[PDB]
Design a protein around this motif. Structure first.
Motif, short mmCIF file in Angstrom:
data_model
loop_
_atom_site.label_atom_id
_atom_site.label_comp_id
_atom_site.label_asym_id
_atom_site.label_seq_id
_atom_site.Cartn_x
_atom_site.Cartn_y
_atom_site.Cartn_z
N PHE A 22 0.82 -1.39 -0.03
CA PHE A 22 0.13 -0.10 -0.02
C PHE A 22 0.72 1.24 0.18
O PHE A 22 0.36 2.17 -0.66
N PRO A 23 1.79 1.35 0.63
CA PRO A 23 2.49 2.52 0.64
C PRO A 23 2.77 3.57 -0.40
O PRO A 23 2.94 2.78 -1.62
N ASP A 59 -0.76 -0.13 -10.33
CA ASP A 59 -2.10 -0.54 -10.50
C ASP A 59 -2.33 -1.81 -9.74
O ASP A 59 -1.70 -2.96 -9.83
N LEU A 60 -2.97 -1.42 -8.58
CA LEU A 60 -3.29 -2.46 -7.57
C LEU A 60 -4.20 -3.71 -8.26
O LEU A 60 -3.86 -4.55 -7.78
N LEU A 61 -5.11 -3.28 -9.21
CA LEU A 61 -5.83 -4.31 -9.76
C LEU A 61 -5.00 -5.51 -10.59
O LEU A 61 -5.31 -6.52 -10.57
#
Lengths: 84, 85
Positions: A51-52, A58-60
């Motif tokens: 997360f930082p 692109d987290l997805l």
């Protein structure tokens, strides 16, 4: 800190289909927990590392590449009362 | 008179209560509902787990059966099987 209870162990073992009798409750023997339960214990701590802000992407499209377990040499496997 | 084995004894007690077809149907219902409870609880109480493949491999090479919670021994009197156990 989470308490490893017998119910969680049973649900997890059933969810993975593990038959190893060391995890099902038998009289006269300590209830053992599967070594893969650590991720259940440590997921909400592990994933907070992607997360930082500095690691921005692109987290997805994230892909889980590899996982590795390693018990510390001389460490006792988990029991059904461990405060972990 | 009639009676039943380990499991079917419930069917025997149904028959002794069965008079008509509908009474038979009702009692069969009470039966299968009972034996379903038995099947559920006798597993949730002693869940059969995995077995070390060396064990069952050897047992099947020895001509014995796939290991199971119940074993049938033949050709031996009780007084000596109780001596082995």
């Amino acid at each position: 800190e989470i308490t490893i209870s017998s119910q969680t162990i049973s649900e997890f073992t059933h969810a993975i289909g593990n038959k190893c009798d060391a995890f099902v409750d038998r009289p006269g023997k300590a209830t053992l927990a599967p070594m893969d339960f650590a991720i259940v214990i440590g997921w909400k701590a592990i994933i907070k590392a992607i997360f930082p802000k500095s690691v921005d992407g692109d987290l997805l499209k994230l892909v889980h590449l590899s996982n590795g377990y390693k018990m510390i040499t001389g460490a006792a496997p988990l029991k059904k009362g461990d405060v972990v | 008179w009639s009676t039943g084995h380990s499991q079917g004894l419930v069917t025997a007690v149904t028959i002794a209560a069965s008079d008509s077809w509908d009474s038979f149907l009702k009692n069969s219902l009470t039966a299968v509902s009972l034996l379903l409870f038995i099947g559920s609880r006798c597993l949730s109480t002693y869940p059969r787990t995995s077995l070390p493949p060396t064990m069952l491999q050897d047992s099947l090479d020895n001509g014995e059966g796939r290991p199971s919670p119940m074993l049938s021994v033949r050709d031996l009197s009780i007084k000596q099987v109780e001596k082995f156990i």
